[PDB]
Structure 1
Amino acid sequence: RKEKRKGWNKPDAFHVCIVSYQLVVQDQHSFKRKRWQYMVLDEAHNIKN
């Protein structure tokens, strides 16, 4: 993931990122830095609490 995040900040190396559900709990300090346009939630009965 550090190798994925070494071409991440300054240029636009991707138009859409695929991040799992449980990885944002650990990497929430890192994914909050970059601004996003769309964030979608698949099968949203997990975040219902």
Structure 2
Amino acid sequence: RKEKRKGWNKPDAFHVCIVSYQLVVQDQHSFKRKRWQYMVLDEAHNIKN
């Protein structure tokens, strides 16, 4: 993940990113820094709580 995040910030290396549900719990501090346009949730019956 560090190797994925070293081409991350300054330029645009991707038009979309694929991140698992549970990884945003640990990496929430890193993912909250970058601005985003669309964040979509699959099978929302998880987050329902």
TM-score normalised by the chain length of structure 1:
1.00
- Structure 2: tracts of 5 or more residues without a match: none
Q: Which runs of 4+ in 1 moved over 6 A?
A: none
How much is the aligned-residue C-alpha RMSD, in angstroms?
A: 0.2
Identity of aligned residues (%): 100
For residue 30 of structure 1, give the secondary structure of its aligned residue in structure 2.
helix
Tell me how many residue pairs correspond in the alignment: 49
Correspondence for 1:43: 43
1:46 and 1:23 mapped to 2: Cα distance? 14
TM-score normalised by the chain length of structure 2:
1.00
Correspondence for 1:12: 12
1:13 and 1:29 mapped to 2: Cα distance? 20
- Structure 1: tracts of 5 or more residues without a match: none
